[PDB]
Design a protein around this ligand. Structure first.
Ligand code: CDL
Ligand code: LMN
Ligand code: LMN
Ligand code: T7X
Ligand code: T7X
Ligand code: PSC
Ligand code: 3PE
Ligand code: 3PE
Ligand code: 3PE
Ligand code: 3PE
Lengths: 179, 485, 90, 469, 91, 89
């Protein structure tokens, strides 16, 4: 199944990596600049960069692990909620309410589309079509993903779709026959 | 033989360009020859066969330039059933009317314009012949550069933004269409309109594949989330661009949802028809409501076309024979009656006064009585006023949508009211009142405009008095796409 | 010293044809009003009335008829029914 | 037979006067044509993916690399035609498009160094060929030395190529320190599991890739492409791209790499949105190369990517070549020639091009819509066959980022069209002198390939099926 | 200086990293310092002649890697042609 | 490996944070090549083979040719501007 997340310590680890990334990026902006700049203008003329890094890190991993622990399953919806929280933190530097809402919903939609494709930049190996069973089944078996058959079982049709609209467990013809 | 026909024909074309500056006579001649050829094909068509009758393969490896008689086939297939031939007849009787529609207003660089218009018509003609997914898709987007060049060079003040939107939104939906087509071609290793109901995919692979095709159909039969390029690409196009667009492109995507989705996404489609009903009711109501506050005149007929395509989509997605038939009748009758309305607003009204704002036009009956006759006859024909073909399509599509879900059928039946409010609100403003103090009196409607109007009105009235005249093509394809186990 | 060639003979562009006399007296107020309405979106801004309209028509009404459409899919058959017979299924 | 040409050529060029340079290039042009025509029957060597190693496992010759050398010769025939033929016989185009004495020397030495990368099996052959082609690009950049921008660009390119060559050398000797070997033929499917060669092989691929112009380190190359003159930059944009990418596609050392996927996403992002608000045509034209090199960084993650690669290579090469040749042709119609080396700069200078030579705009429209990927044209099948390999192999987020990047990049491709189909006040009617027959036939050949090259797709797939499988 | 310090420590440790084969990050690092063991040099009498190192460089530049020597001749040729081609100003 | 690694790293960082003149960049490039040489020749000695010595004798020649090429490039940079800036090119 799944096992519950360490929201405490993953959020501490995320705050550590965000602090380090803010240190590195503030040093990078210091070195790549003009004007009178010294060693302690790294945190005064930084442009608020450590706040960006740490706030995004705490917000995303807190909301991700909390949503995965509240829903008790793991899919791309947790990436949607965590990206909504990250967009909230990135949109609060904009001191404006409609832009804040735009940052929230659009970053959450982009991160949910990210987390729905697998939440991986790279590939999954066995989930690929190259490294999976493909083509026809050669004789009758549970049809996997990436596989094609000629006929499907009708019990699978009734269980997956339903028993409602035009769909029935026995066809209309043989349900109405003379004997 | 067949090569000598063509280099005779290329020499024919070169000589008449050398002696006559214009092309338009030969383009009209080739259009009417194409008409006669398609009707000779309809004579030789076997209605008793479900299969594809007039097949040909292009760009095979054994014969790259020409036809293919081979054991192995990897080119592009072409062929027709009754469903294809319905839209081919509708297409081929509209191509000469759009070449005729700009017979005098395009003055500066005419030959470019008529070549672009005939080229777009030929691409959309070949769209309905195609039999692979990649052969459908190649012609399905060959239109877009020609549309971009046509809308950008010719148009009103704002033809740059309209040309950009007709490339942008169409390309953006149709790229996700290409995503799903690539997934189909790497699972099945075949793209084919013949075999493709035999293959069964997994349910969650089907529900992934179905999304990208439906997003492109939502862009091109413009349903509510993106319905939005359409008023600006209409309101700023030239005349034949508007006519070809709203008579053929929207019905082409209506054809694509039958041809591409209903055969191999059946078990997906049943899971998703409530979402389609959300989107189609929500693009009937909200677009039919947003037409009431419009200052411009071609934009009203653009939003009208949105509402009628929203009626047709809940006919195809109804899982009913009545809904499929009514969506086909709606598409064909709409492709008749709506280019006549775009001619009323863009040809008889923009050639004379060169403005399109509603506030200048009042009391057009007292100087133009037969234009006003046309305006009221076309208004009622567009509403869903019966004996017109529009009511046959709207009635059978609303009935199928009532079978599949009765509550969304109940709230979709108010489209009869909503479609009439804005149309009659426009029509009584145009016809009624004292004549406008802004408009100086011009000519009444001319012989060619009355000719185009009379053809596009008779062809709605014949379908409206007897919709059986094209059942002989469709009675297979009305049973073909039904999944009721 | 870099001038395009002496052998250009370039001249002015004309559209060609007939100058149609003006059938319509322009109205400056109607033209300004309509140019204002056509390009309304580049001056559009988010307000409270805007937010009310956006939430009511883009999220609230889709969620409402979505709830109605998903609750009522296989409910009703009315095809052949009689007095004392159910017309729903669940 | 390149060696023969170099050995013959510097002997012959030392004795010619400067009056003869252009005619010398014409000679070399025809020479390379008869190396294509009379000598390509060597494709019969490579039946059923038969691969040779030559000079003691030093060079590797398969049919992939045979196709790459055919492509490089075809492009060199086009470029050498651009130098060796006059556009017009004005006193204008003689002071604009003028070859130096030692230009064709450096061209053939660079083609040599570019071939010895794709044909390479060991790491010191790779190194020596990388520096041969790098010194040649230094000197091709610096050969028009009467120009402030080209001098500054050659200095910048020297230092930024020196760093990224020392990074390749560090990665090679770092690979040597853990394996007493030089081949990637050493790897053979089992060593990669039990050995961490990830950091080594990825640092190798990265040091090779930052010379193309991949995204964190892209701006220096965009500045070199804007600062070089208009004839030099059509050669130095294409040749290191196709040589280094044809090395890294043939050697599959970054399969399913997370770093290459990060930098490919970033490359597709920063190239698409980077060239949006840009008003110089070579800038606009170089961010196109940034995105189209991103589409190759995608195929670096792939195993068995030789169809999608080679198709999209000759696609991009023909389209690239044609879009630079069209803006060579538009110089006759602009109202303002600055900057003798780079006579057209701003993209608004081609504004009334439909009213002066409308078929040049037909040309332009065809190649721009093929850049976008419109289905009747040849760029569509390149993007299509890249997608068929991306989706087959599990790169699902990469696919959507590819699609969004192509949609964003369509804006500044169509901006060229939007400028050229516009009204202009003073249009041409009658011009006395003509464009080169020899050289406008090349542009028309390059267009007819792009438009009517979808015809031969099934022929090409069958010939592919026999010679690579 | 702050990025100098960060890049010094990072690039230094990272250059020390790739001499190691562990799954483990700092077992990769501290195997670079596991240096302390004194190599045992043995005499074997299998070599009969004064092939020193320059002799074997001359054998393998000239037989097994002769092509590298000739492409290197092209590189030396380029180092002649290029500086001349820049700095002459022909007449 | 220590001496080659640290000369390469310190040489690299002296190249990167060079803001004072241009020839410090050249000599930091050459000392980078020296550090690469040091690492490789140590590995050749430790592995008992000439092949690292082969790549080292080839990269000596390539470093020389790059110095010749690039210093002629600086001379042509200097032809039109009779000054070389302190901040850089
Ligand atoms: C169909 C296509 C759908 C696509 C639509 C998306 C476009 C929306 C455009 C919104 C907009 O107007 O922004 C303009 C705005 C331009 O700025 P501006 O000049 O200050 O002011 C513009 C207006 O005047 C300001 O006027 P306003 O304040 O009244 O507008 C309100 C609000 C309105 O925007 C809305 O669209 C609201 C819609 C809410 C309705 C919800 C209904 C749902 C049904 O728009 C905004 O101002 C800001 C929106 C935030 C932009 C978020 C950009 C990053 C999102 C991720 C994209 C990838 O854009 C930005 O500044 C954004 C920053 C630039 C891009 C930076 C990208 C950072 C990336 C962050 C990480 C992303 C994570 C990705 C996942 C990866 C996983 C590893
Ligand atoms: C604008 C339109 C956007 C459209 C985007 C749609 C993308 C949706 C992707 C769907 C899809 C790729 C299919 C794509 C095919 C073509 C796609 C076309 C291009 C798309 C660009 C990626 O599936 C992903 O779904 C994610 C959630 O949905 C998961 O997230 C993560 O969740 C948690 C992980 O444990 C993490 O803890 C959390 O951190 C993550 O978040 C991922 O793990 C998962 O890989 C599904 O592939 C996969 O499906 C499965 C189950 O059938 C198949 O199962 C196998 O086969 C059967 C017997 O063998 C059995 O039944 C099945 O048991 C067996 O295992 C696989 O073979 C595989 O193929
Ligand atoms: C929980 C949400 C809270 C809702 C609050 C409304 C909200 C967000 C709207 C987002 C809609 C979300 C839609 C759903 C998602 C889609 C994304 C916009 O607030 C707007 O409310 C309008 C109507 O009340 C006002 O228009 C009026 O029209 C005429 C009378 O009709 C009047 O004559 C005319 O004077 C008014 O201009 C606007 O001025 C105001 O900006 C936030 O309001 C708050 O934040 C900011 C703006 O962040 C507001 O304005 C800012 O402050 C100004 C000094 O106050 C400064 O000048 C300036 O710094 C800035 O303007 C504030 O005022 C405050 O209220
Ligand atoms: C310039 C001039 C020359 C200058 C020289 C000075 C510097 C010299 C050092 C040299 C470095 C040069 C720089 C190189 C660029 C960076 C290279 C780099 O990140 O590749 C990473 C390093 O993979 C490590 O295993 C990760 C490595 C971790 C490194 C740790 C560093 C610790 C520093 C602490 C402070 C490559 O993983 P990758 O993407 O394939 O990803 C892997 C994935 O992680 C695995 O799960 C899979 O098995 C595999 O398929 C693949 O997906
Ligand atoms: C299979 C793979 C696919 C390959 C695709 C092939 C692409 C390029 C193939 C080129 C092979 C070319 C065949 C064309 C030969 C025929 C051809 O048109 O003559 C040239 C172009 O001549 C190339 O430009 C010669 C260009 C040579 C380029 C060779 C590249 C190999 C055009 O002369 P033209 O009539 O306009 O003009 C001349 C001239 O202007 C007057 O001075 C004279 O009065 C009279 O001679 C007049 O005729
Ligand atoms: C006398 C002839 C002298 C030799 C002429 C050679 C010129 C080299 C030119 C290169 C650029 C021009 C494109 C030409 C593409 C040729 C396709 C091809 O044939 O390449 C093959 C497939 O390529 C692949 O996988 C993928 C290739 C993708 C091609 C995509 C572009 C398609 C449209 C342009 C090509 C068709 C034009 C035909 C016009 C009649 C692979 O290599 P081969 O060993 O079988 O080559 C044999 C060609 N021989 C017999 C003429 C030597
Ligand atoms: C335990 C270990 C803890 C480690 C701590 C985490 C460290 C993470 C690395 C931190 C990266 C910092 C990025 C950075 O260097 O800052 C940006 C830099 C400065 O930018 P700036 O001067 O502000 O530009 C002004 C723009 N107006 O601007 C730059 O020019 C940097 C160029 C890009 C740097 C490489 C980016 C790599 C990631 C690619 C983007 C990913 C895309 C994914 C989709
Ligand atoms: C690069 C640039 C990217 C820019 C991005 C712009 C925004 C893109 C559009 C927004 C896409 C948002 C997608 C969010 C998807 C989140 C997700 O993972 O959905 C998974 C869901 C299946 O989840 P399941 O576990 O089966 O059921 C859970 C029920 N609570 O699957 C579903 O239920 C289907 C959800 C369909 C959502 C359709 C959205 C329109 C397409
Ligand atoms: C790609 C390029 C392929 C060109 C194929 C042209 C075939 C034309 C054959 C018909 C013919 O005989 O035309 C000859 C005619 C003569 O040339 P002309 O300019 O009129 O000479 C005047 C001398 N005083 O020449 C012409 O009539 C001009 C023909 C020009 C064609 C321009 C096409 C522009 C794009 C049209 C829409 C796209 C069509 C493709 C999609 C369908
Ligand atoms: C703008 C960019 C987009 C433009 C894209 C335009 C696409 C144009 C594609 C051209 C398709 C050509 C297909 C021709 C088919 C003609 C034909 O079928 O018959 C004539 C002959 C073959 O004879 P056939 O009887 O078919 O032989 C097989 C018998 N089983 O076949 C022939 O001889 C016809 C030869 C045609 C040569 C045309 C070359 C290009 C000219 C321009």
């Amino acid at each position: 199944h799944f096992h519950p997340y360490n929201t405490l310590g993953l959020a501490t680890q995320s705050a550590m990596v965000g602090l380090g990334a803010g240190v590195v990026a503030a040093a990078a902006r210091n070195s790549l600049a003009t004007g009178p700049r010294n060693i302690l203008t790294t945190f005064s003329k930084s442009g608020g960069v450590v706040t960006i890094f740490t706030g995004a890190s705490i917000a995303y991993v807190f909301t991700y692990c909390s949503a995965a622990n509240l829903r008790e399953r793991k899919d791309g919806w947790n990436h949607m909620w965590a990206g909504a929280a990250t967009g909230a933190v990135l949109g609060a530097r904009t001191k404006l309410v409609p832009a804040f809402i735009g940052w929230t919903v659009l970053c959450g939609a982009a991160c949910g589309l990210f987390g729905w494709t697998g939440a991986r930049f790279n590939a999954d190996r066995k989930a690929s079509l190259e490294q999976s069973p493909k083509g026809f089944v050669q004789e009758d078996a549970h049809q996997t993903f990436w596989e094609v058959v000629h006929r499907r079982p009708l019990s699978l049709t009734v269980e997956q779709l339903g028993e409602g609209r035009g769909i029935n467990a026995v066809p209309i013809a043989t349900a109405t026959e003379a004997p | 033989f067949l090569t000598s026909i063509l280099l005779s024909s290329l020499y024919l074309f070169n000589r008449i360009l050398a002696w006559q500056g214009n092309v338009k006579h030969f383009y009209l001649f080739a259009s009417n020859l194409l008409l006669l050829f398609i009707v000779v094909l309809y004579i030789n068509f076997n209605t008793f066969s479900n299969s594809f009758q007039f097949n040909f393969e292009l760009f095979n490896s054994l014969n790259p330039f020409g036809l293919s008689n081979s054991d192995i086939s990897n080119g592009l297939l072409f062929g027709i059933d009754g469903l294809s031939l319905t839209f081919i007849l509708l297409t081929v009787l509209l191509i000469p009317l759009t070449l005729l529609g700009n017979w005098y207003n395009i003055n500066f660089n005419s030959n470019l314009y008529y070549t672009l218009v005939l080229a777009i018509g030929l691409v959309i003609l070949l769209n309905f012949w195609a039999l692979d997914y990649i052969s459908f898709y190649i012609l399905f987007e060959a239109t877009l550069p020609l549309l971009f060049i046509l809308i950008h060079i010719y148009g009103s003040s704002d033809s740059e933004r309209a040309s950009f939107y007709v490339l942008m939104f169409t390309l953006s939906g149709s790229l996700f269409m290409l995503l799903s087509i690539v997934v189909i071609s790497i699972v099945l290793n075949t793209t084919n309109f013949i075999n493709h109901n035999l293959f069964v995919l997994s349910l969650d692979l089907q529900t992934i594949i179905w999304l990208g095709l439906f997003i492109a159909i939502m862009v091109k039969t413009p349903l509510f989330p993106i319905h939005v390029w359409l008023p600006v690409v209409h309101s700023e196009s030239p005349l034949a661009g508007s006519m070809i667009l709203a008579g053929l492109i929207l019905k082409l995507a209506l054809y694509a949802i039958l041809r591409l989705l209903l055969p191999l996404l059946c078990e997906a489609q049943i899971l998703y028809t409530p979402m389609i009903y959300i989107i189609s009711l929500l693009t009937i109501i909200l677009t039919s409501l947003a037409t009431l506050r419009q200052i411009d005149l071609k934009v009203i007929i653009a939003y009208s076309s949105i509402s009628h395509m929203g009626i047709a989509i809940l006919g195809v997605c109804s899982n009913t024979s009545l809904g499929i038939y009514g969506s086909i009748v709606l598409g064909v009758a709409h492709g008749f009656v709506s280019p006549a309305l775009f001619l009323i607003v863009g040809g008889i009204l923009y050639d004379r006064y060169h403005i399109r704002i509603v506030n200048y036009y009042k009391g057009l009956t007292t100087y133009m009585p037969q234009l006003a006759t046309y305006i009221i006859i076309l208004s009622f024909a567009n509403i869903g006023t019966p004996l017109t073909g529009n009511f046959t399509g709207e009635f059978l599509s609303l009935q199928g949508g009532f079978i599949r879900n009765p509550i969304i059928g109940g709230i979709s039946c108010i489209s009869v009211l909503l479609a009439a409010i804005y149309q009659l609100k426009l029509t009584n403003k145009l016809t009624g009142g004292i004549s406008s103090i802004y408009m100086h009196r011009t000519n009444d409607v001319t012989i060619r405009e009355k000719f185009i109007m009379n053809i596009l009105i008779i062809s709605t009235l014949i379908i409206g008095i007897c919709p059986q005249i094209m059942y002989n093509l469709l009675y297979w394809t009305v049973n073909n796409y039904i999944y009721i186990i | 010293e870099l001038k395009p060639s002496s052998a250009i003979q370039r001249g002015p562009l004309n559209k060609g044809g007939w100058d149609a006399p003006h059938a319509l007296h322009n109205d400056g107020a109607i033209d300004r009003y309509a140019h204002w309405r056509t390009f309304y979106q580049e001056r559009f801004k988010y307000t409270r009335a805007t937010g009310k309209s956006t939430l009511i028509f883009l999220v609230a009404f889709p969620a409402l008829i979505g709830y109605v459409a998903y609750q009522s899919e296989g409910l009703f058959e009315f095809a052949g029914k009689r007095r004392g017979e159910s017309v729903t299924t669940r | 037979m390149l060696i023969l040409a170099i050995i013959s050529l510097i002997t012959f060029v030392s004795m010619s006067k400067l009056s003869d340079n252009r005619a010398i290039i014409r000679l070399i042009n025809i020479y390379l044509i008869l190396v294509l025509v009379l000598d390509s029957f060597l494709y019969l060597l490579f039946l059923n993916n038969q691969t040779y190693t030559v000079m003691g496992e030093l060079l590797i010759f398969n049919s992939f690399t045979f196709y790459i050398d055919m492509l490089i010769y075809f492009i060199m025939i086009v470029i050498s035609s651009l130098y060796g033929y006059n556009l017009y016989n004005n006193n204008l185009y003689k002071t604009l498009f003028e070859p130096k004495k030692e230009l064709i020397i450096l061209f053939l030495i660079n083609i040599l160094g570019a071939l010895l990368i794709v044909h390479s099996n060991d790491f010191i052959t790779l190194f020596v060929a990388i520096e041969l082609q790098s010194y040649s690009i230094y000197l091709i950049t610096a050969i028009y030395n009467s120009s402030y921008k080209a001098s500054k660009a050659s200095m910048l390119y020297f230092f930024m190529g020196g760093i990224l060559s020392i990074l390749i050398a560090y990665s090679i000797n770092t690979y040597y320190s853990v394996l007493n070997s030089y081949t990637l033929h050493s790897l053979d499917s089992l060593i990669i599991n039990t050995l961490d060669l990830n950091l080594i092989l990825i640092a190798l691929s990265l040091g090779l890739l930052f010379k193309i112009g991949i995204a964190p380190l892209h701006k220096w190359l965009i500045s070199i492409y804007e600062n070089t003159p208009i004839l030099i930059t059509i050669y130095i944009s294409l040749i290191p791209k196709i040589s280094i990418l044809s090395y890294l596609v043939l050697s599959n050392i970054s399969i399913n790499s997370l770093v290459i996927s990060i930098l490919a996403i970033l490359t597709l992002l920063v190239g698409s949105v980077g060239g949006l608000l840009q008003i110089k045509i070579k800038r606009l034209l170089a961010f196109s190369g940034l995105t189209n090199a991103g589409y190759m960084m995608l195929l670096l993650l792939l195993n068995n990517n030789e169809f999608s690669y080679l198709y999209y290579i000759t696609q991009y090469s023909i389209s690239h070549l044609a879009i630079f040749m069209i803006i060579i042709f538009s110089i006759y119609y602009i109202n303002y020639i600055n900057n003798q080396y780079n006579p057209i700069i701003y993209v608004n200078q081609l504004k009334g091009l439909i009213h002066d030579n409308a078929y040049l705009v037909l040309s332009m429209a065809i190649v721009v819509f093929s850049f976008i990927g419109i289905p009747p044209l040849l760029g569509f099948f390149g993007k299509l066959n890249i997608l068929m390999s991306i989706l087959n192999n599990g790169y699902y987020f990469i696919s959507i980022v590819l699609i969004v990047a192509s949609l964003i990049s369509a804006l500044y491709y169509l901006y060229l069209l939007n400028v050229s189909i516009q009204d202009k006040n003073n249009i041409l009617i009658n011009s006395n002198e003509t464009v080169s027959s020899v050289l406008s036939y090349i542009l028309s050949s390059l267009i007819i390939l792009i438009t009517f090259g979808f015809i031969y797709n099934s022929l090409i797939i069958d010939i592919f099926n026999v010679y690579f499988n | 200086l702050p990025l100098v310090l960060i890049s010094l420590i990072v690039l230094t440790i990272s250059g020390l990293m790739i001499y190691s084969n562990d799954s483990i990050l700092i077992n990769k690092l501290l195997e670079a310092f596991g240096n302390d063991y004194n190599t045992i040099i043995t005499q074997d009498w299998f070599n009969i002649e004064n092939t020193t190192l320059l002799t074997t460089i001359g054998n393998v530049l000239l037989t097994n890697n002769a092509f590298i020597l000739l492409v290197l001749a092209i590189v030396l040729l380029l180092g002649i042609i290029g500086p001349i081609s820049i700095t002459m100003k022909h007449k | 490996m220590f001496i080659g690694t640290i000369i390469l790293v310190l040489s690299f960082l002296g190249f990167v944070f060079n803001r004072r003149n241009i020839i410090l960049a050249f000599i930091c490039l050459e000392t980078m090549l020296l550090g690469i040489n040091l690492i490789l020749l140590r590995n050749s000695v430790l592995f008992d083979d000439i092949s690292g010595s082969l790549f080292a004798i080839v990269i000596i020649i390539l470093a020389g040719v790059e110095s010749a090429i690039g210093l002629s490039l600086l001379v042509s940079y200097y032809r039109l501007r009779g000054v070389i800036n302190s901040y850089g090119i």
